[PDB]
Swiss-Prot record, chain B:
Subunit note: Homodimer.
CDD domains: ketosteroid_isomerase
EC nos: 5.3.3.1
Native species: Pseudomonas putida
Protein name stated in the entry: Steroid Delta-isomerase
Induction: By steroids.
Annotated residues for binding of substrate: 103
GO molecular function terms listed in the Swiss-Prot or TrEMBL record: steroid Delta-isomerase activity
One biological process term in Gene Ontology: steroid metabolic process
Impact noted for substituting residue 125 to A: Slightly reduces activity and reduces protein stability
Effect of residue 57 to S: Reduces activity 100-fold
Active site: 16 (proton donor), 40 (proton acceptor)
Catalytic activity: a 3-oxo-Delta(5)-steroid = a 3-oxo-Delta(4)-steroid
Length: 126, 128
């Protein structure tokens, strides 16, 4: 599995791709059988077309930004967790959302599971 | 308490950090369900139940000189779960060190911690 240091690089790369809005590059980071639970508590999304649609829905507008708010925490079993903040415009109102993503990577360095922790308690109207 | 709401999760997880910060081992243990699991660090074997959990916190905190504080807000779900970023300050080689950690928790229907996973490794340890 990816080492702790490699997990830190992969998870930071993911945020860089979200921030620029490269949907195809994000989807490429995922494994064939990957699941996305975003927000955690909702049913998992699976299937590569379905994951792509999820990111297109979320990032299609092109005006979403995302940045780490602290370092990636990484394990020795190919997993990690990171805190970040998303900036977006919601019905014309600039907003921010605080999020933590937890990821497990497979033996090939691809995301096998992603879980995004957030709810409206983490939303701030700027 | 029932299964905590998102707002209740934020309060519970923040109190947990306050209890770690002050070192009240018995109060930490009582926040956990009687049959809770802990994986700390995530990747290592889980430990089961309040007796084992108490031994774990006494071994980590009993020596004193550990402090802990949130580094950003608790992220909370609608299914009784949450995740939080924090930093632990302690002493290493006679000098301050710091460890960045994220804990993920799932609460039960009585407002007690059913599971906890702590994400960190030696890449998250730093010094002056
Ligand atoms: C998909 C996403 C970014 C990538 C990531 O890793 C985690 C999230 C979860 C919150 C999403 C966000 C994208 C922008 C969204 C759709 C909003 O405008 C409201 C909720 C928010
Ligand atoms: C148990 C603990 C606090 C409560 C919490 O929620 C997460 C952790 C994980 C890292 C522990 C820390 C306590 C202090 C420890 C023992 C050290 O001096 C090195 C590793 C670190
Ligand atoms: Cl942080
Ligand atoms: Cl944060
Ligand atoms: Mg029970």
């Amino acid at each position: 599995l990816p080492t702790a240091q490699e997990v830190q690089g992969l998870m930071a790369r993911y945020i860089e791709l979200v921030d620029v809005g490269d949907i195809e590059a994000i989807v490429q980071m995922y494994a064939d059988d990957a699941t996305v639970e975003d927000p955690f508590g909702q049913p998992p999304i699976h299937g590569r077309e379905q994951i792509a649609a999820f990111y297109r829905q979320g990032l299609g507008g092109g005006k979403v930004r995302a940045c780490l708010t602290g370092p990636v925490r990484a394990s020795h079993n190919g997993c990690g967790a990171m805190p970040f903040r998303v900036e977006m415009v919601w019905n014309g109102q600039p907003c921010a959302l605080d999020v933590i993503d937890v990821m497990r990577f497979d033996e090939h360095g691809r995301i096998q599971t992603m879980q995004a922790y957030w709810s409206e308690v983490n939303l701030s109207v700027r």
